[PDB]
């Protein structure tokens, strides 16, 4: 009579990392890619012979900086003249060109100079997330919910849908990232009455705070605040500067001019930073870092906390601003939700908990997975086609 329907997927199309989930058997499965990773870098690389997407693109970035594209989400739906675009271009090793006041990324690919619109690069990331899902389900996937930041305008939302259409996905809906994180915790299933929810989203490069009101499952965005110059990469930079100084003291050598040594140092720092979220100390062990000198050292969580102390405290300024904009007091917030890998930092959790007078933080769903989790819950709801009984 009626063939079984394929599952719909939920995609968190992130600035630095993307995540895909599917709701089946009353639960969400976050789908790992073929290298066993539950999140996939939003990177696309171009060579004379291949186009690489995800981990394969990010793993070859050091020697191919001009032809490895990342951060397309910062360009999507924006004009070339937009002041945000002009400032961001100074930090990118790839070329951004002007095509009718619309930015395009220009690379060497298969023997030619090729330019792509940001939605075309995002469609390549979406094609990889669709293939990750089809490898797990064992059949072709058509339907998806894709998330966007709450501050995205109409042009940014339409370009995200366009990226989905290019990838061969039927876009069921574009939903806000803070709404998806709230849905992940079932905060829209608590029945009658108003609930105020604060979403605290600390990413690789930016920080976003959102205040939502939920009434009978209806979401209203009350306030958004944040810091475009605060993320995980700033904490990595503080460790980098600390270890460059430490090498100077110990071996009387300045390593800061050998890109390879700095890159090996930063890669090691990011991993030490992750270890410090679970351990009270972490070792750093690099062989022949500079002039054949082995760099074997350690860092305590207390020293790391001191190195980033001002940056961690500054996350509370957009929280107070969002609360003023929403015209609410901190005691009036019913639920606190953590989003982003950087929220695993114990000190970040402690500062926010202390600000909300000891309140529990919702962090049981991996913070780097909560947005895709909620998007997958919504995708399964949107494809239901139940006919009422008499
Ligand atoms: N356990 C963790 N503790 C501290 N930081 C983390 C952790 N896991 C992730 Br993921 N991150 C950071 O989150 C950002 C995501 O773009 C990057 O800066 C990652 O370094
Ligand atoms: Mg995100």
Curated annotation (Swiss-Prot):
Species, as recorded: Homo sapiens (Human)
Family label: Belongs to the heat shock protein 70 family.
UniProt keyword annotations, A-Z: Acetylation, ATP-binding, Chaperone, Cytoplasm, Cytoskeleton, Host cell receptor for virus entry, Host-virus interaction, Methylation, Nucleotide-binding, Nucleus, Phosphoprotein, Receptor, Secreted, Stress response
Binding site for ATP: 14-17, 73, 204-206, 270-277, 341-344
The protein, known as: Heat shock 70 kDa protein 1A
Positions bearing N-acetylalanine: 4
Disease with which this protein is associated in UniProt: In certain aggressive cases of activated B cell-like diffuse large B-cell lymphoma (ABC-DLBCL), plays a role in the cytoplasmic sequestration of misfolded N-terminal mutated PRDM1 proteins, promotes their association with SYNV1/HRD1 and degradation through the SYNV1-proteasome pathway. HSPA1A inhibition restores PRDM1 nuclear localization and transcriptional activity in lymphoma cell lines and suppresses growth in xenografts.
Summary of subunit composition and partner proteins: Component of the CatSper complex. Identified in a IGF2BP1-dependent mRNP granule complex containing untranslated mRNAs. Interacts with CHCHD3, DNAJC7, IRAK1BP1, PPP5C and TSC2. Interacts with TERT; the interaction occurs in the absence of the RNA component, TERC, and dissociates once the TERT complex has formed. Interacts with TRIM5 (via B30.2/SPRY domain). Interacts with METTL21A. Interacts with DNAAF2. Interacts with PRKN. Interacts with FOXP3. Interacts with NOD2; the interaction enhances NOD2 stability. Interacts with DNAJC9 (via J domain).
GO molecular function terms noted in the UniProt entry: ATP binding; ATP hydrolysis activity; ATP-dependent protein disaggregase activity; ATP-dependent protein folding chaperone; C3HC4-type RING finger domain binding; cadherin binding; death receptor agonist activity; denatured protein binding
UniProt effect for mutating residue 79 to R: Significant loss of acetylation and ATPase activity. Decreased binding to HOPX and HSP90 and increased binding to STUB1 and NAA10
Residues of the full protein shown: 1 to 380 of 641
Purpose of the protein: Molecular chaperone implicated in a wide variety of cellular processes, including protection of the proteome from stress, folding and transport of newly synthesized polypeptides, activation of proteolysis of misfolded proteins and the formation and dissociation of protein complexes. Plays a pivotal role in the protein quality control system, ensuring the correct folding of proteins, the re-folding of misfolded proteins and controlling the targeting of proteins for subsequent degradation. This is achieved through cycles of ATP binding, ATP hydrolysis and ADP release, mediated by co-chaperones.
The keyword Transcription regulation appears for this protein: no
Upregulating conditions: By heat shock.
Modified residues (N6-acetyllysine): 79, 110, 248, 350
PTM field: In response to cellular stress, acetylated at Lys-79 by NA110 and then gradually deacetylated by HDAC4 at later stages. Acetylation enhances its chaperone activity and also determines whether it will function as a chaperone for protein refolding or degradation by controlling its binding to co-chaperones HOPX and STUB1. The acetylated form and the non-acetylated form bind to HOPX and STUB1 respectively. Acetylation also protects cells against various types of cellular stress.
A single BP term in Gene Ontology: positive regulation of interleukin-8 production
Domain description: The N-terminal nucleotide binding domain (NBD) (also known as the ATPase domain) is responsible for binding and hydrolyzing ATP. The C-terminal substrate-binding domain (SBD) (also known as peptide-binding domain) binds to the client/substrate proteins. The two domains are allosterically coupled so that, when ATP is bound to the NBD, the SBD binds relatively weakly to clients. When ADP is bound in the NBD, a conformational change enhances the affinity of the SBD for client proteins.
Entry GO terms, CC: aggresome; blood microparticle; centriole; centrosome; cytoplasm; cytosol; endoplasmic reticulum; extracellular exosome
Chief location of this protein within or outside the cell: cytoplasm
Source superkingdom: Eukaryota
Stretch list, region Nucleotide-binding domain (NBD): 4-382
Compartments, as annotated in UniProt: Cytoplasm; Nucleus; Cytoplasm, Cytoskeleton, Microtubule organizing center, Centrosome; Secreted
């Amino acid at each position: 009579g009626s063939m079984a329907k394929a599952a719909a997927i939920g995609i968190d199309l992130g600035t630095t990392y993307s995540c895909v989930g599917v709701f089946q058997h009353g639960k969400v499965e976050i789908i790992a890619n073929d290298q066993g990773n539950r999140t996939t870098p939003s990177y696309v690389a171009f060579t004379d012979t291949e186009r690489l997407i995800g981990d394969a693109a990010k793993n070859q970035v050091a020697l191919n900086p001009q032809n490895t594209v990342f951060d397309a989400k910062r360009l999507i739906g924006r004009k070339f003249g937009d002041p945000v675009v002009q400032s961001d271009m100074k930090h990118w090793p790839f070329q951004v060109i002007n095509d009718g006041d619309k930015p395009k990324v220009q690379v060497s690919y298969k023997g030619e100079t090729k330019a792509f619109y940001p939605e075309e690069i995002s469609s390549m990331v979406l094609t990889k997330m669709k293939e990750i899902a089809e490898a797990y389900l064992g059949y072709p996937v058509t339907n998806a919910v894709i998330t966007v930041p709450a501050y995205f305008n109409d042009s940014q939302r339409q370009a995200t849908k366009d990226a989905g259409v290019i990838a061969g996905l039927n876009v069921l809906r574009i939903i806000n990232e803070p709404t998806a994180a709230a849905i992940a915790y079932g905060l829209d299933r608590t029945g009658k009455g108003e609930r105020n929810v604060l979403i605290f989203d600390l990413g690789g490069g930016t920080f976003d705070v959102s205040i939502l009101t939920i009434d009978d499952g209806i979401f209203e965005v009350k306030a958004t605040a944040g810091d475009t110059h605060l993320g995980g990469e700033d904490f990595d930079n503080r460790l980098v500067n600390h270890f460059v100084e430490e090498f100077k003291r110990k071996h009387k050598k300045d390593i800061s001019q050998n890109k390879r040594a700095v890159r090996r140092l930063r890669t090691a720092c990011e991993r030490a930073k992750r270890t410090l979220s679970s351990s009270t100390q972490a070792s750093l062990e690099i062989d022949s870092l500079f002039e054949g000198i082995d760099f074997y050292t350690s860092i305590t969580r207390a020293r790391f906390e001191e190195l980033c102390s001002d940056l961690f405290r500054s996350t509370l300024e957009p929280v107070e601003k969002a609360l003023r904009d929403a015209k609410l007091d901190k005691a009036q917030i019913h639920d606190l939700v953590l989003v982003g890998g950087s929220t695993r930092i114990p000190k970040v959790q402690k500062l926010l908990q202390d600000f909300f007078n000891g309140r529990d933080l919702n962090k049981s769903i991996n913070p780097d997975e909560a947005v895709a989790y909620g998007a997958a819950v919504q995708a399964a709801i949107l494809i239901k086609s139940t006919r009422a009984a008499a």
